[PDB]
Structures are given as C-alpha cells and as structure tokens.
C-alpha cells in the first residue's frame, strides 16, 4: 500500500471515489496539497467546493476526509479548495507585425482568439496550418487580424470540424458535457506561408512539445512555472496547479480540461481572446522553453488574505497533437521542410 507518486495514481484514486466525491463537491483535480496558501510536495486530490468553512460548521459526515485509498492500497491526500494588455508586443500580435506566428490574433465572423502553434499533419496531404482552441459554438473562416466584414486581413484557412461511452463510464452529462479541446486550421491553398514564423515572439525559440508522462513524479508538472503569449494580455507567467480537472453540474460531470494554471503574483494568467495561446514551460537551466498545452477559452480562493484568483484551462498539448495527428513546427528549417512536403 504505497503512497501515490504520479498523476496516474491520483487519477485512479479520484475515479475510484468519483461517484461519492461528486456528492459533496463542484469538481476535482489532482496535484499537490495546498496548505495555508502554499504548494506542498504532498500528492493530493484537489476537491473544489462552493464555500470552504471550518469543520465546526459542517454537518456530521459532511467533512471531506484527509486521506483516500484506491485500488491496490495506493493512497493520497484530499485537499479542499473553494471555487467562487497594451504594449509593443500586443500591437504586433494584433496586426502590426510583418509575420504571422504563435500569439498572432486570429478571428472569424463569429469568434476571435490567439494562434497557438504552427503544425503539420503527420499523414495524408501533410498540410501545414496552425493550432488554436476549439470554440464551443463547421466551415469557420479564419483571418488575421480581422475578417473581411470588420476590417482588413488575409484569409488563413477554415477550421477542421473534427460520445456515448463518456456518459456510460465517466458519468458525463451528455446534455452539457464539454472537454477542453484544440482545433486545426490548415492554411488555405493561396496563403503565403513565407509570412509565418515559428518563433514565439515574447519568449524566443521553443523546443519540441514536452509530453506529460502520467507515471513520472508529480513535480515534473505540478508547480512548474509556465508562460503564455496571447493577443489580449501579451506575455504572462503562471504556475501549473492541477491536472485532469472534472467539473460537476447537477446530473454529472459537465466539464473536463487537462491542465489548470494560475497566474503568478495574484495576476490573471489569461484574458478573453488569449484562448489558443501556447502554454510554455519557462527554462530553468538554459534549455529552450518547451510547450505543454493550449489555452482553452470562475474564480479560485487560494489565499485568506486576498480575494479569489482567476484560473486558466489548458489542453494537454502532446495528447492534442496525437488526437489530431499533428507535429509542431519549431524552426524555420522544419517549416520549409513541411511546406515542400505538402501534397
């Protein structure tokens, strides 16, 4: 009966008790216990409650336990958490730059956001396009910086358009369930890809996607510093606080997202319009920063001294690329290789 040591361990304990944990919680996630506002190294399932109160005011047997035991004697802690812009860089991202890349504004007749990454299809026509958040509203036409009806811009491409077993074994509410996801926009045939850069302007050259391994120690992901560059807030930095967040409505889970990020220094990590931004691990030892997710477009009580903070939903990048069968392009050389290999 060993203590949990990985994201998978926490996720199976959380799943094993999910039906009961939804009875007294708004949702759950996995990470490290947060105690007196500070991150611990104690693996835990984070339980989100509408209002966190002292034990004395809870009904008998309404107090969440401190420990949970899953299959095989693997155990973990239980942690209760309450769930209640103008710069040179932003100016370049929104249309004043001579190149298009990560951070650039992308807009349709219906939505607007940030271009996350330049990617290519692994198979088939091997088209070169970009990756951004999947908006929750088929042939949606993407322009930078604005669609024709609102102002000038070039046509980038159309969003590529693409379950019962979720409601069966995950207990999702089929009427309301949404899993945070990304979308692939292949570049239109007549779009000039020589105007594309693989650099992230506010950070610099990035390395290849950092795959989130669910069996490695938790401090590989939880507590890591990240940054993002988006059209609305420019450059911001945050911390990865949790993984595999489940959110609950009255009849089951209604929201899942892979990554939870909180901005540093009680500052918001993202604003509306930053959805699609690349979530990047900042470099701690001199290596190139590596992306881990995409921002997907409530407040979180972390300190008792200050008010609740905004939180950010992220899509696991490595699993997104696998699901869409895409490769990230991180050099101009790789990009020119990808372009000439389009069929």
């Amino acid at each position: 009966g060993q203590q949990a040591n990985s994201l998978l361990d926490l996720m199976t304990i959380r799943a094993f008790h999910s039906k009961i944990l939804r009875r007294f919680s708004l949702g759950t996630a996995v990470g490290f216990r947060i105690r007196k506002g500070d991150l611990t190294d104690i693996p835990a399932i984070l339980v989100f409650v509408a209002r966190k109160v002292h034990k004395k005011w809870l009904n008998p047997a309404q107090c969440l336990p401190a420990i949970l035991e899953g299959p095989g004697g693997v155990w973990c802690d239980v942690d209760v958490v309450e769930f209640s812009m103008f710069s040179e860089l932003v100016d370049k991202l929104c249309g004043s730059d001579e190149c298009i890349g990560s951070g650039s504004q992308v807009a349709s007749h219906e939505t607007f956001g940030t271009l996350g990454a330049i990617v290519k299809r692994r198979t088939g026509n091997k088209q070169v396009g970009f990756l951004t958040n999947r908006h929750v509203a088929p042939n949606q036409k993407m322009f930078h910086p604005l669609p024709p009806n609102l102002g000038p811009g070039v046509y980038l491409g159309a969003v590529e358009r693409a379950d019962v077993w979720y409601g069966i074994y995950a207990g999702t509410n089929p009427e309301t369930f949404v899993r945070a996801d990304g979308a692939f926009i292949p570049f239109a045939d007549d779009f000039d890809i020589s105007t594309v850069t693989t650099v992230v302007r506010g950070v610099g050259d990035i390395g290849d996607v950092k795959v989130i391994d669910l069996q490695c120690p938790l401090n590989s992901l939880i507590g890591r510093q990240v940054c993002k560059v988006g059209r609305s807030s420019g450059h911001t930095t945050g911390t990865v606080m949790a993984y595999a967040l489940e959110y609950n409505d009255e009849k089951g889970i209604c929201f899942f997202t892979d990554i939870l990020v909180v901005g540093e220094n009680r500052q918001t990590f993202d604003l509306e319009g930053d959805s699609g931004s690349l979530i990047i691990l900042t470099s701690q030892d001199g290596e190139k920063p590596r992306p881990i997710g995409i921002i997907w477009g409530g407040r979180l009580k972390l300190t008792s001294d200050h008010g609740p903070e905004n939180w950010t939903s992220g899509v696991d990048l490595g699993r997104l690329l696998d699901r869409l069968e895409l490769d990230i392009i991180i050099t101009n050389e790789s990009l020119q290789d990808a372009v000439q290999q389009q069929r």
Copy 2:
C-alpha cells in the same frame, strides 16, 4: 431664550416646526452644523435636501431659515445638507465568513431570504432567559445559519428570528436547542473586549454622541471607522426613521451590503473599553449619498438603531465577557 444644549432641545424644536421643515426637504435630523465641510460645535437641526443650491436660485418661500425657536424660546441653528436615499478581503473577513472556529460579533448570518452580520450576544432579561444574538430586522420563521443556509451551502443552524412608514429596528434570534454555545465568543474580533452598552442620554450635551468616532466589524467590510453625524433621522420621499447616522472616515465607506447588524462601537478615547451604541440597520446600507465637502464627491452614510433603546424594547441584556456568557448559559430555563 437660551441656545439648545442637548439632543432633546434640538428634537423638541424640530417637532414644533415639523410640517414646515418637511415641505421642502427629504428629511431632518439633529446634531451639529456642518460648515465649509467641517463639523462645528453649533447645535443645529440638519435639513436634508435632494439638491443644495445657492439662495439666488431659490424662490424666497423655499429658502430655509438659519435659526428656529421652539417652545420657551429655546433656539438652534438650521443646517442644509444635500442628501438622498438612492445615491473586503482580509484575514478578518475570512474568519467572519466561516473560517473561524467560533461565532461572535461580526460573524456572517444568513437565511434563505436574507444575510448580514451578527451584532451582539444577548440574553432575555426575564422568563426563560434564553441566550441568543442581535442583528438587524429585515424589512415563515426566517431561521438562520452560519455561514450559509442549507439551500446555498454549509453552515450550522443558529436559530429562528423572533418576531416582535418603517422604523429601523433590530431582531433577537434565540439560539437553537441543539446549538453549541461554547462555540460563541463575546469578543468583537478586530476591536477587542467591549464594555457595557452606552445609553444614549437625550439630555446631556451633544458632544457626547455627535462627532464621536465609531467603528464596526462586519462580514462585508471587516473593520471600518467613522463619525456619528446626527441623531433621530426622519426621511420622507413623498417613510423611514432611524436613530443614528454615521459617515465613514477618510472619505471611505463605513459599511457595505451585508454589514447590516454590525455593532456600532464608540472607540476608546482614554483607555476604557470601547462601548457599543447601536446596530447597523439594513436597507439604506449601500443606498444613499451625502455631500459633506465641495472638494470631494458625495459620501455614503449608514443607518444605526439605537442599541440601548433596542435592548429595552426587546428586553435584552448584552453579554460582554465569556465568563458572563458561561454563566448565562447555565441560568437558561
């Protein structure tokens, strides 16, 4: 014909001219004249008007006089004030709203219909001598929880509200039969130990109440300090009477919505314990402007229910030490 020297003097003068004063005012109160934004020592009837303008733009019949004489030649000043009915995050507020291990003055109390602040720990003077708490009376029992009622969130059941123009009033919630009173403290967190209620004497000099610094601890704004600006406020739109008027210090609001029921406490000027004089009244909590200086915009004002007169009418005694509280629990029948 001596000048007015007490609250009673001002009020008897005010009553004698009541109809005449209401004809061109939203309401009246008694206190000290406010001149060039500063409090004077000049006893005055405060006349509250929707919009204060220079006399040159007023018709003579609407211009208020500067002096009024009541029965027996007792006289006072008349002071015109622009007025209207219409118009956070800290360790302390967190404790008041549910994270503390005790319940007391400042603690959040809520029902399915209302929410506010617990003002004082009190007991019935006679009969069964039940121990309960005092808060504002909101304008079929309304049974109260800390911090939240079952339909909105977690909390312990405190008790049901006892039911006793709108006059500002407080209400007594006797603690439920199964409530653990050992979780109650008579300390006002953020202020300390308080002394006994300070009776508002209507015949002593005005400077005992008007102009005194006060503080309150409430679930919405934590600790704030202010000044008592007037007594015996009467309002008539076309309506409501409250005992105490407070304006927050440093052009900062004295209360926010949810602070109603908070204890209004005279700060200690010489080393004695601070003494309560009132309870914040709900309604007019967030609503209401008050022009005090022409340098700054209008300021918020707060309504207070006279505590000493509230306790008498409900026949309650305030409990101000945890020893007195332990005793009162043992004497309940």
Copy 3:
C-alpha cells in the same frame, strides 16, 4: 508644386481625392502627421481607420499612399490613425449651482438634457438680445417643454431660475441638396456639429451673469480660425475647457474639419478635434457646450476658439490604450452663422444689457 502650408491647402487636396480617401476609412481630417505617437510639423491629411495593420495584410487597393498631390501640384502627407466614433472639485460644485453667479461653465439643464454654458453673447443686429451660447443637441425631443433652460435644474428635478429657450437652428449649407451631393454627404443621417443661442428671458436678472471664465480667468476676443495662415496657429496648440462634469482640463488641437463616414457617405462633420493632455480625457458627458480656449503661454489673455459638441478610440501610442477625443465647433464661424458677438468683460455686458431693444 509647393508643400501644403495651410488648412485650405490640405482641405483642397482632401476634396480632390475624396473618393480614394473615403473608400476604406471611417473618416478624414487635416492637421500634422502623427508618427510614433508624437506630433510632427509635417502637414498631412489624417485618415481614420478602425484598425491600423501592417502593409502585408492590406490589398494594394486598400493601402493608403504616403503623399497626395492636388490641383496645381500642391502636395501633402497622408497619415493613418486608429480611430472609432463625475469629477468633483470646488469649481465643479460652484458650476453646478453653489455659485452666486451664472457664467461660462455653469450647468444649464432642460427637462431632457443638461450641459455647460459656453459664452455670454449678444445679437449683432435687430433687438440685440443678450443670451448665452451652448451646444446644439441632436437626437433630442425639442418640443415645447424641452427647450427651456434653467440653472441648475429644471422645475421637475429641483430648484433653479429660468434662463431662456433654445432658438431653433436657422440653417446650414449642408441643407442645400446641390452642395450636399458635391460634398458627398448622406442626407438621411448627416449631422453638422453646431452651437445654439439661448436669449435670456425677459425677467431673468442679468446682473447675476459674469463674463469671467472661472478656473481660467478673463478671456480675450474670439480667435478666428484663419484657413490660409500657417497650420501651427491652430494645429498642436494647447487649449483648456471648464465644464460642469470634469471641471478644468487641458488638451491639444489634433485636427481640423473632421468628416466622418457611414455606408452611404459623410454623416458627421465637426470643426475641431481635441485630445486630452497626459492620457486623460478632455471632456465628460455634460461638458458639451464648454468654451474651448487657447491657453496663453506668453502673458496675453486666453482666447476662445470653439464650443464642445456633445451627443471614440483614437489610439495614438502602442504602450498606452486608446484616448478619448473631443469634437469642437469653430467658434468664430458659429458666431458668424448665428450673427452673435461674444461679451468678454463685465462692463461690456452692462453696456449690451442697456443696449437691448
């Protein structure tokens, strides 16, 4: 083929190229080129666009040229500007009803609207009535109990004295269809920013009126905006305004002769554009009608040049957000249009009052 050297030079160039300038812009004005957030001394036509973007995202049809040449070879620059279409003090308190006099900056209100008194004026001819000048409200219900001005409030809202009734606008050249077609106006929507004259009521006590501008002081005579003199007499000059909502503010004149577009043509014209100094707004709602006054950095008395017109992004630098802009009505031309003279001393007012017929 000389460079443009006056407002008239820039405006004739702008007219000669009206079709090209209007096809992809929200509007145009004339002034000095703005570069890297700063005013230059380069005469230019300002072209206002909803979003300013890099050349790489523009079709050659939509990319504006940097220079335009008109008839006779006279040329100028073209500058692209990103565009679009409550304060408490001792002064504001006096302006809103606590002062013992009425004058420029005082609050004036009707049953429907409120604003600022601009200037004390008199008719040149006829009965030579004394009154005041304020903005002409558009989209307002000007029917019998709505042209009645009071200070500070109308009888339904509070106390105040009756000042007079707004005189309907007698005109414009825009109303001539023949001229309108040549200028490209849309008749269905076009609005000319304008002022209005309120003659004082027969029983209004004019001895309660002052010609002083509180917060600035005594003013000189109206400064006529000359269209053939060098641009730096107006463009870039610092101005101030006293109004009921924001009290005293200072700004800079950024452009002249703004023409604003809609789907069919020109729908708004105003004479002056002002931007507040130090990234702070020049006006708030209710300051409309305030006198726009040239500040005197020399020792002469400040001179009025316009009136604030009432009821825009104008993003100038990349580090700061968009700034508000203010529409001003050319005072000298407004006075000519309404056949009015401004009264600038309290002795001169008494003369005009005794000279009323």
